[PDB]
Amino acid sequence: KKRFSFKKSFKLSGFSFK
Amino acid sequence: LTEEQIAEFKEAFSLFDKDGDGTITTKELGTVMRSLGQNPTEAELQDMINEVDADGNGTIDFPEFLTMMARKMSEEEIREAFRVFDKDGNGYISAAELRHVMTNLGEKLTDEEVDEMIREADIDGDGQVNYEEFVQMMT
Ligand SMILES: [Ca+2]
Ligand SMILES: [Ca+2]
Ligand SMILES: [Ca+2]
Ligand SMILES: [Ca+2]
């Protein structure tokens, strides 16, 4: 779901995960 | 630091901050990590916060979160993160796999949001993310 001022990044999500 | 990069950090923060109270607790951290198949102990979670908890209030605020991510940014750690997404183990993260991970994280995605995410890391343009791509992304 699109949220203004928010953006889903794979990269940052990767680091967020182990 | 660009405007799009901030919006990504903001969303990364929101994924952890389940109750949206502006801080990330050890509880929220554990819930996320378990949702990604990990099982940190209470000590490990406390250690994670303590490392970046500049004001010593026990929880992570936005800047402390940013610091956590910047410190995060070997083969084994990357392989492990790859396997969080590559569920069938075939060596390729598909859109359906990525969507599955995001959904377990409590984040609903439109087909376009998911496709856009694959597009970001897909270098060869096969529509999937192989290990090497995933490494270029994380590194
Ligand atoms: Ca919170
Ligand atoms: Ca703090
Ligand atoms: Ca796969
Ligand atoms: Ca690819």
PDB file of C-alpha atoms and ligand atoms in Angstrom:
ATOM      1  CA  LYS A   1       0.000   0.000   0.000  1.00  0.00           C
ATOM      2  CA  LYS A   2       1.438   3.310  -1.132  1.00  0.00           C
ATOM      3  CA  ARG A   3       2.149   5.808   1.690  1.00  0.00           C
ATOM      4  CA  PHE A   4       3.275   9.381   0.924  1.00  0.00           C
ATOM      5  CA  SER A   5       6.814  10.108   2.287  1.00  0.00           C
ATOM      6  CA  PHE A   6       7.346   6.295   2.593  1.00  0.00           C
ATOM      7  CA  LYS A   7       9.096   3.935   0.196  1.00  0.00           C
ATOM      8  CA  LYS A   8       9.785   0.207   0.424  1.00  0.00           C
ATOM      9  CA  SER A   9      13.420  -0.592  -0.274  1.00  0.00           C
ATOM     10  CA  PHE A  10      14.733  -4.088  -0.864  1.00  0.00           C
ATOM     11  CA  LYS A  11      18.223  -2.972   0.235  1.00  0.00           C
ATOM     12  CA  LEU A  12      17.275  -1.508   3.567  1.00  0.00           C
ATOM     13  CA  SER A  13      14.911  -4.460   4.050  1.00  0.00           C
ATOM     14  CA  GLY A  14      17.840  -6.816   3.411  1.00  0.00           C
ATOM     15  CA  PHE A  15      20.020  -5.205   6.092  1.00  0.00           C
ATOM     16  CA  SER A  16      16.968  -5.219   8.368  1.00  0.00           C
ATOM     17  CA  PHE A  17      17.020  -8.979   7.967  1.00  0.00           C
ATOM     18  CA  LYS A  18      19.603 -11.650   8.768  1.00  0.00           C
TER      19      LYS A  18
ATOM     20  CA  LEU B   1      21.186  12.146   1.611  1.00  0.00           C
ATOM     21  CA  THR B   2      18.275  12.307  -0.835  1.00  0.00           C
ATOM     22  CA  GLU B   3      14.634  12.597  -0.316  1.00  0.00           C
ATOM     23  CA  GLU B   4      13.935   9.046  -1.564  1.00  0.00           C
ATOM     24  CA  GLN B   5      16.546   7.554   0.702  1.00  0.00           C
ATOM     25  CA  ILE B   6      14.806   9.162   3.764  1.00  0.00           C
ATOM     26  CA  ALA B   7      11.435   7.798   2.683  1.00  0.00           C
ATOM     27  CA  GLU B   8      13.030   4.324   2.534  1.00  0.00           C
ATOM     28  CA  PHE B   9      14.485   4.650   6.009  1.00  0.00           C
ATOM     29  CA  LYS B  10      11.114   5.898   7.193  1.00  0.00           C
ATOM     30  CA  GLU B  11       9.370   2.823   5.836  1.00  0.00           C
ATOM     31  CA  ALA B  12      12.145   0.549   7.210  1.00  0.00           C
ATOM     32  CA  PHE B  13      11.470   2.167  10.616  1.00  0.00           C
ATOM     33  CA  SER B  14       7.746   1.743  10.334  1.00  0.00           C
ATOM     34  CA  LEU B  15       8.156  -2.012   9.654  1.00  0.00           C
ATOM     35  CA  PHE B  16       9.731  -2.385  13.128  1.00  0.00           C
ATOM     36  CA  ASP B  17       7.615   0.151  14.909  1.00  0.00           C
ATOM     37  CA  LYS B  18       4.421  -1.986  14.914  1.00  0.00           C
ATOM     38  CA  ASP B  19       2.430   0.243  17.275  1.00  0.00           C
ATOM     39  CA  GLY B  20       3.726   3.363  15.535  1.00  0.00           C
ATOM     40  CA  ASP B  21       4.667   5.103  18.788  1.00  0.00           C
ATOM     41  CA  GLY B  22       7.864   6.509  17.333  1.00  0.00           C
ATOM     42  CA  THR B  23      10.213   4.064  19.016  1.00  0.00           C
ATOM     43  CA  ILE B  24      11.398   0.489  18.427  1.00  0.00           C
ATOM     44  CA  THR B  25      11.473  -1.746  21.482  1.00  0.00           C
ATOM     45  CA  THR B  26      13.196  -5.017  22.098  1.00  0.00           C
ATOM     46  CA  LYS B  27       9.768  -6.561  21.714  1.00  0.00           C
ATOM     47  CA  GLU B  28       9.207  -5.054  18.265  1.00  0.00           C
ATOM     48  CA  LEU B  29      12.714  -6.100  17.224  1.00  0.00           C
ATOM     49  CA  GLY B  30      12.023  -9.694  18.356  1.00  0.00           C
ATOM     50  CA  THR B  31       8.700  -9.889  16.547  1.00  0.00           C
ATOM     51  CA  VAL B  32      10.370  -8.767  13.285  1.00  0.00           C
ATOM     52  CA  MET B  33      13.268 -11.116  13.642  1.00  0.00           C
ATOM     53  CA  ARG B  34      11.042 -14.058  14.414  1.00  0.00           C
ATOM     54  CA  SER B  35       8.831 -13.160  11.442  1.00  0.00           C
ATOM     55  CA  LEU B  36      12.056 -13.535   9.314  1.00  0.00           C
ATOM     56  CA  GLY B  37      12.706 -16.945  10.852  1.00  0.00           C
ATOM     57  CA  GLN B  38      15.303 -15.912  13.409  1.00  0.00           C
ATOM     58  CA  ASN B  39      15.210 -16.398  17.162  1.00  0.00           C
ATOM     59  CA  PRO B  40      17.178 -13.841  19.152  1.00  0.00           C
ATOM     60  CA  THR B  41      17.265 -14.194  22.957  1.00  0.00           C
ATOM     61  CA  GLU B  42      16.280 -11.430  25.275  1.00  0.00           C
ATOM     62  CA  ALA B  43      19.892 -10.641  25.949  1.00  0.00           C
ATOM     63  CA  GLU B  44      20.668 -10.375  22.250  1.00  0.00           C
ATOM     64  CA  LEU B  45      17.771  -7.956  21.736  1.00  0.00           C
ATOM     65  CA  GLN B  46      18.855  -5.834  24.681  1.00  0.00           C
ATOM     66  CA  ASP B  47      22.408  -5.817  23.314  1.00  0.00           C
ATOM     67  CA  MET B  48      21.118  -4.621  19.955  1.00  0.00           C
ATOM     68  CA  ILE B  49      19.392  -1.662  21.447  1.00  0.00           C
ATOM     69  CA  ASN B  50      22.196  -0.849  23.902  1.00  0.00           C
ATOM     70  CA  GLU B  51      24.720  -0.563  21.099  1.00  0.00           C
ATOM     71  CA  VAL B  52      22.915   2.459  19.658  1.00  0.00           C
ATOM     72  CA  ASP B  53      20.914   3.747  22.574  1.00  0.00           C
ATOM     73  CA  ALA B  54      22.627   7.135  22.884  1.00  0.00           C
ATOM     74  CA  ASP B  55      20.117   8.536  25.475  1.00  0.00           C
ATOM     75  CA  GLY B  56      19.872   5.288  27.457  1.00  0.00           C
ATOM     76  CA  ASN B  57      16.057   5.269  27.503  1.00  0.00           C
ATOM     77  CA  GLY B  58      15.965   1.616  26.528  1.00  0.00           C
ATOM     78  CA  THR B  59      14.294   1.968  23.078  1.00  0.00           C
ATOM     79  CA  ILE B  60      15.400   3.063  19.580  1.00  0.00           C
ATOM     80  CA  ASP B  61      14.262   6.442  18.196  1.00  0.00           C
ATOM     81  CA  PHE B  62      14.624   7.503  14.537  1.00  0.00           C
ATOM     82  CA  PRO B  63      18.260   8.647  14.642  1.00  0.00           C
ATOM     83  CA  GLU B  64      19.363   5.685  16.701  1.00  0.00           C
ATOM     84  CA  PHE B  65      17.657   3.463  14.108  1.00  0.00           C
ATOM     85  CA  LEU B  66      19.563   5.189  11.368  1.00  0.00           C
ATOM     86  CA  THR B  67      22.783   4.565  13.235  1.00  0.00           C
ATOM     87  CA  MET B  68      21.891   0.881  13.671  1.00  0.00           C
ATOM     88  CA  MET B  69      21.323   0.571   9.903  1.00  0.00           C
ATOM     89  CA  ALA B  70      24.481   2.501   9.031  1.00  0.00           C
ATOM     90  CA  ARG B  71      26.594   0.156  11.201  1.00  0.00           C
ATOM     91  CA  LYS B  72      24.951  -2.815   9.429  1.00  0.00           C
ATOM     92  CA  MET B  73      25.902  -1.280   6.033  1.00  0.00           C
ATOM     93  CA  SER B  74      30.866 -11.883   5.307  1.00  0.00           C
ATOM     94  CA  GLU B  75      29.497 -14.439   2.817  1.00  0.00           C
ATOM     95  CA  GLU B  76      27.613 -16.228   5.654  1.00  0.00           C
ATOM     96  CA  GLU B  77      25.598 -13.251   6.866  1.00  0.00           C
ATOM     97  CA  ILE B  78      24.588 -12.396   3.280  1.00  0.00           C
ATOM     98  CA  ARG B  79      23.778 -16.041   2.471  1.00  0.00           C
ATOM     99  CA  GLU B  80      21.604 -16.215   5.484  1.00  0.00           C
ATOM    100  CA  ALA B  81      19.721 -13.020   4.549  1.00  0.00           C
ATOM    101  CA  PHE B  82      19.327 -14.421   0.986  1.00  0.00           C
ATOM    102  CA  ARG B  83      17.735 -17.509   2.393  1.00  0.00           C
ATOM    103  CA  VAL B  84      15.170 -15.496   4.268  1.00  0.00           C
ATOM    104  CA  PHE B  85      13.766 -14.575   0.823  1.00  0.00           C
ATOM    105  CA  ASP B  86      14.659 -17.578  -1.307  1.00  0.00           C
ATOM    106  CA  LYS B  87      12.127 -19.867   0.257  1.00  0.00           C
ATOM    107  CA  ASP B  88      12.142 -22.710  -2.239  1.00  0.00           C
ATOM    108  CA  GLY B  89      15.908 -22.620  -2.273  1.00  0.00           C
ATOM    109  CA  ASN B  90      16.222 -22.527  -6.075  1.00  0.00           C
ATOM    110  CA  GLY B  91      18.802 -19.695  -6.043  1.00  0.00           C
ATOM    111  CA  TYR B  92      16.414 -16.967  -7.234  1.00  0.00           C
ATOM    112  CA  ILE B  93      14.192 -14.639  -5.282  1.00  0.00           C
ATOM    113  CA  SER B  94      10.956 -14.263  -7.131  1.00  0.00           C
ATOM    114  CA  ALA B  95       8.324 -11.606  -6.763  1.00  0.00           C
ATOM    115  CA  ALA B  96       5.985 -14.101  -5.080  1.00  0.00           C
ATOM    116  CA  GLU B  97       8.795 -14.930  -2.558  1.00  0.00           C
ATOM    117  CA  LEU B  98       9.450 -11.287  -1.838  1.00  0.00           C
ATOM    118  CA  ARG B  99       5.727 -10.645  -1.375  1.00  0.00           C
ATOM    119  CA  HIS B 100       5.505 -13.632   0.984  1.00  0.00           C
ATOM    120  CA  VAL B 101       8.281 -12.175   3.203  1.00  0.00           C
ATOM    121  CA  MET B 102       6.727  -8.712   3.245  1.00  0.00           C
ATOM    122  CA  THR B 103       3.316 -10.188   4.142  1.00  0.00           C
ATOM    123  CA  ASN B 104       4.786 -12.117   7.070  1.00  0.00           C
ATOM    124  CA  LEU B 105       6.231  -8.771   8.140  1.00  0.00           C
ATOM    125  CA  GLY B 106       2.674  -7.389   8.242  1.00  0.00           C
ATOM    126  CA  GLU B 107       3.212  -5.240   5.145  1.00  0.00           C
ATOM    127  CA  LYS B 108       0.655  -5.617   2.351  1.00  0.00           C
ATOM    128  CA  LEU B 109       2.043  -4.913  -1.119  1.00  0.00           C
ATOM    129  CA  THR B 110       0.553  -4.090  -4.482  1.00  0.00           C
ATOM    130  CA  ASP B 111       1.891  -6.114  -7.379  1.00  0.00           C
ATOM    131  CA  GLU B 112       3.530  -2.865  -8.511  1.00  0.00           C
ATOM    132  CA  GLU B 113       5.279  -2.191  -5.220  1.00  0.00           C
ATOM    133  CA  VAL B 114       6.702  -5.736  -5.312  1.00  0.00           C
ATOM    134  CA  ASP B 115       7.732  -5.563  -8.960  1.00  0.00           C
ATOM    135  CA  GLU B 116       9.394  -2.234  -8.225  1.00  0.00           C
ATOM    136  CA  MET B 117      11.354  -3.819  -5.424  1.00  0.00           C
ATOM    137  CA  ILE B 118      12.597  -6.703  -7.640  1.00  0.00           C
ATOM    138  CA  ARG B 119      13.468  -4.140 -10.325  1.00  0.00           C
ATOM    139  CA  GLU B 120      15.775  -2.353  -7.890  1.00  0.00           C
ATOM    140  CA  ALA B 121      17.998  -5.348  -7.339  1.00  0.00           C
ATOM    141  CA  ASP B 122      17.535  -7.214 -10.593  1.00  0.00           C
ATOM    142  CA  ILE B 123      20.615  -6.421 -12.628  1.00  0.00           C
ATOM    143  CA  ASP B 124      20.394  -8.911 -15.508  1.00  0.00           C
ATOM    144  CA  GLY B 125      16.678  -8.215 -16.104  1.00  0.00           C
ATOM    145  CA  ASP B 126      15.408 -11.811 -15.769  1.00  0.00           C
ATOM    146  CA  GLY B 127      12.805 -10.534 -13.295  1.00  0.00           C
ATOM    147  CA  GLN B 128      14.333 -12.404 -10.357  1.00  0.00           C
ATOM    148  CA  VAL B 129      17.121 -11.710  -7.887  1.00  0.00           C
ATOM    149  CA  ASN B 130      19.962 -14.225  -7.872  1.00  0.00           C
ATOM    150  CA  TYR B 131      22.617 -14.433  -5.093  1.00  0.00           C
ATOM    151  CA  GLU B 132      25.173 -12.222  -6.889  1.00  0.00           C
ATOM    152  CA  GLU B 133      22.527  -9.569  -7.392  1.00  0.00           C
ATOM    153  CA  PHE B 134      21.500  -9.843  -3.813  1.00  0.00           C
ATOM    154  CA  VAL B 135      25.232  -9.434  -2.868  1.00  0.00           C
ATOM    155  CA  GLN B 136      25.680  -6.347  -5.086  1.00  0.00           C
ATOM    156  CA  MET B 137      22.573  -4.944  -3.403  1.00  0.00           C
ATOM    157  CA  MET B 138      23.641  -5.602   0.182  1.00  0.00           C
ATOM    158  CA  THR B 139      27.315  -4.728  -0.320  1.00  0.00           C
TER     159      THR B 139
HETATM  160 CA    CA C   1       6.941   1.055  18.862  1.00  0.00          CA
HETATM  161 CA    CA C   2      17.140   5.518  22.850  1.00  0.00          CA
HETATM  162 CA    CA C   3      13.311 -18.934  -5.047  1.00  0.00          CA
HETATM  163 CA    CA C   4      18.118 -11.141 -12.024  1.00  0.00          CA
END
